[PDB]
From a paper:
[name] relies entirely on carbohydrates as a source of carbon and dedicates a third of all uptake systems to carbohydrate import. In the case of type I and II ABC importers a [name] (SBP) presents the bound substrate to the outward-facing side of the transporter, which selectively binds the ligand and transfers it to the transmembrane domains. SBPs are formed by two α/β domains connected by a hinge region, which are interdependent in the apo form. Upon ligand binding at the interface between the two domains, the protein closes around the ligand in a more rigid conformation; ligand binding in this way has been termed the ‘Venus fly trap’ mechanism.
The structure of the carbohydrate-free [name] [name] at 1.61 Å resolution reveals it to belong to the newly proposed subclass G of substrate-binding proteins, with a ligand-binding pocket that is large enough to accommodate complex oligosaccharides. [name] is a dimer in solution and the crystal structure reveals a domain-swapped dimer with the monomer subunits in a closed conformation but in the absence of carbohydrate ligand. This closed conformation may be induced by dimer formation and could be used as a mechanism to regulate carbohydrate uptake. SP009239–491 folds similarly to other substrate-binding proteins, presenting two globular α/β domains linked by a hinge region formed by three loops. The most striking feature of the oligomeric SP009239–491 structure is the presentation of a domain-swapped dimer structure. The hinge loop connecting the swapped and main domains is located at residues Gly366 and Lys367, which are positioned between the β15 and β16 strands. The members of subclass G are characterized by their larger molecular weight, additional structural elements, an enlarged ligand-binding cavity and a regulatory EF-hand-like calcium-binding site. SP009239–491 possesses all of the features characterizing this subfamily apart from the calcium-binding site and shows approximately 24% sequence identity to the other subclass G members. In the case of SP009239–491 the loop spanning residues 315–319 is reorganized to form an additional helix, α10. This helix is positioned in the central part of the ligand-binding cavity and may play a role in substrate interaction or recognition.
Author numbering:
A (entry chain A), B (entry chain A): 37 to 490
């Protein structure tokens, strides 16, 4: 059409309060890079699947969505095949994907998802409120399981009786080293500690039954909420309403750092399970393109950009630069040279290749790096940059001058000879045949013409 | 042909003693990335232009060369036009080039060079031997010019009479803020401190004549070599044979760090001129492709790779990893969050885009980063990764089970109800109609089939 296309994306959860500002900032970059704009509309947490499934079938046009019931819907033809789009529009994004993301999201030989590259493996963890651990001196060194959590819950119940000891909710189920390959509400798992060729009922796995017994003991003791089976209310990571909770953590979280940042306090973690790449971890955050989208190519271009352009993605995820965050350091690859490094055991940087991909030696200071950036930014061009002197009309005159120059120039230019004597001598020989003046005037004329852009 | 092509590059100067090792290491990468190999043959310093000009005209086949007399030879048709090759094979390399490199190397509307991205501007500098500055306590704070160098040369001549005070050679000429737009041995310059529209004779510029007078005074005093007008011998940066020398320095050198590294000692620098982008700085290190090359496309692919692949280029320029250098730090973009950052003023990383391009917050430790790398490397795949359960034969049985599950599961899974009572109750309802067993057996059969790859 006549305007740059606007691609509409549906997202799960509630909108940021500053969504207009975030999209303005993002769209500066998206418009510049791919000649389009992104509109993100949020559908809430509660009835996401319902809103996506039924209202889409008989209703509205869309380009991109956060997927619900991906595996089922992919088989029904709800989503545009991405197999060919990944070869061109999505080529950069595809290279960043762990092969498990491809295996996990392939349906009958085609791929229909853009997965967010992140916790391709993850583990279940207890997350502890560090403010309360410090206040009461409760040691968590022995905690490796629901069963071994008990002594620590006993301590917090005694010392701080109004804090919820283990803050869980109505979707809770005990975690183990299980693969639930199908997300359908049924009790069937592969026990990764048992026979991995067998489908088993979790309620018949002895250690899982033991966990349920433990949880029920916690219920009787008031260690978990009285209304756990019915409650919606979330526990704010920032507040001191809770002592321990269960969290999914993977390599993209960098240990306890992300939780501690979001909570703005010390959050300590102890793993309950091992990490593994499975359907659940590879399918958790999938974008799809509507099979009815009128902008399939541009939709992929935007997804490619969201997953490869750090200015764009950081602006959305950290929020507005200067209000939400600021830069404190830039990426630097450093080396130190060793005794093997000598003039004869390597090539020279100046005549081998782009010096800006060379690693930075240990003796370089941050000040020297910043000075180099400032100097590159401040440097101007000579007005004679790109000037070429055509010698066609003055061939023999240049040869005459150059021959005369070569007899004097080294003696004069090194200061071997006194210039007061040698320059007048040189100038007489250059001008004795008129070649000097001919070349000088031709050079000036062509330079005049160059500066006037003729 | 039948074999991966071997691209032959001619280079100026003398070969590294370990050239075979360097090319083996490089060619591992070049072969893998572009399906070709690079052969580099060195032609020496002395007669490079002669060897390149005449022996090429009537002699041998080649693909790539370090250019000599680029501007003249480009106009004669010696070099393959790169204008179109830069649009595909060289697209990444072209994006890394300062526009001055394009302007400086364009000849009659076409570009024939791959310039090394490096000191697009540079300045002339005095470089001092820091070992001698320290030993004798000679202060260089007042040195800004050839004239103001005199007192420091007087001091070293007195204190260390056998050291060469200002180590210059037969190609020396005093430097100034001049543009020599044509490299032809002639005396014509643009004075960047004067009228930049005029071509002038350097020997008539008053301050340049003054420099020659100064240099001649240095000659009479024994501050420069007695044989400067004839000598070939270089002064080794590593040795204490010299006190000051003149060096070209630009932003790619990071101040005095590169000189100090190559010398393996403190080298101090003082600039003589300003920095500017001109023909001399943009044309200094140009690779060309022979107009007679049988591998023009692959030649550009190799040049593109040399100028964009850090593993490749660092291997050649630093030399062999573990013998010549070792890694001490990897590139990291860091931020700190500010008071604006709250749950409602940004998007979530997990469902927005590739988390590996997100900047690293200040509270993340290097240990947490390394742990994340190790965990990503160690994580395995579930044997059920990619398993899809076809429900076609068990639709009503799944619905029956799922309905029964939804009546019990929250009470059991949260531990609200005692599992000793509730699990037997649940299991009776699931099996009362035989739907449980039907779904379990179908799931196991399809899983068996999946594991056998049917
Ligand atoms: Zn367990
Ligand atoms: Zn750094
Ligand atoms: Zn004299
Ligand atoms: Zn000067
Ligand atoms: Zn770093
Ligand atoms: Zn009970």
């Amino acid at each position: 059409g006549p305007d740059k296309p606007v691609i509409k994306m549906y997202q799960i959860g509630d909108k940021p309060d500053n969504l207009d500002e975030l999209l303005a900032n993002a769209n500066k970059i998206i418009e510049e890079k791919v000649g389009a704009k992104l509109d993100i509309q949020y559908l809430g947490w509660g009835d996401y699947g319902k809103k996506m499934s039924v209202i889409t079938s008989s209703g509205e046009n869309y380009d991109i969505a956060f997927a619900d019931n991906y595996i089922v819907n992919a088989q029904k033809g709800a989503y545009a095949d991405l197999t060919e789009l990944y070869k061109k529009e999505g080529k950069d994004l595809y290279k960043a994907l762990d092969p498990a993301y491809i295996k996990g999201n392939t349906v009958n030989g085609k791929i229909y998802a853009v997965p967010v590259a992140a916790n391709v493996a993850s583990s279940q963890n207890f997350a502890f409120n560090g403010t309360l651990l410090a206040k009461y001196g409760i040691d968590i060194s022995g905690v490796t399981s629901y069963e071994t959590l008990e002594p620590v819950l006993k301590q917090i119940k005694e010392k701080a009786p109004d804090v919820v000891p283990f803050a869980i909710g109505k979707v809770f189920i005990p975690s183990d080293n299980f693969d639930y390959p199908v997300a359908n509400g049924l009790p069937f798992v592969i026990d990764l500690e048992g026979d991995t060729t067998k489908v088993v009922n979790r309620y018949e796995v002895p250690r899982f039954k033991e966990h349920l017994k433990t949880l029920h003991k916690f219920y009787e003791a008031g260690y978990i909420p009285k209304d756990v089976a019915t409650s919606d209310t979330s526990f704010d990571l920032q507040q001191d309403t809770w002592f321990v909770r269960e969290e999914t953590v993977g390599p993209a979280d960098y240990g306890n750092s992300l939780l501690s940042r979001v909570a703005n306090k010390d959050i300590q973690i102890k793993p309950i399970t091992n990490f593994i790449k499975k359907n659940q971890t590879t399918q958790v955050a999938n974008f799809v393109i509507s099979n009815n989208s009128k902008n399939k190519e541009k939709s992929m271009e935007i997804l490619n950009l969201l997953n490869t352009n750090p200015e764009l993605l950081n602006g959305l995820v950290y929020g507005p630069e200067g209000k939400n965050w600021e830069k404190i350091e830039g990426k630097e690859n450093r080396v130190r040279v060793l005794d093997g490094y000598k003039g004869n055991t390597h090539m020279g940087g100046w005549n081998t290749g782009n010096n800006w991909i060379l690693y930075i030696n240990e003796n370089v200071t941050d000040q020297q790096i910043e000075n180099s950036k400032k100097e590159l930014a401040e440097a101007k061009e000579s007005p004679a940059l790109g000037f070429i002197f055509n010698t066609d009309n003055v061939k023999s005159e240049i040869s005459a001058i150059a021959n005369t120059m070569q007899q004097f120039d080294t003696a004069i230019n090194t200061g071997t000879v006194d210039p007061d004597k040698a320059i007048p001598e040189l100038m007489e020989k250059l001008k004795s045949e008129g070649a000097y003046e001919k070349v000088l005037n031709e050079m000036q004329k062509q330079y005049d013409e160059f500066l006037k852009n003729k």
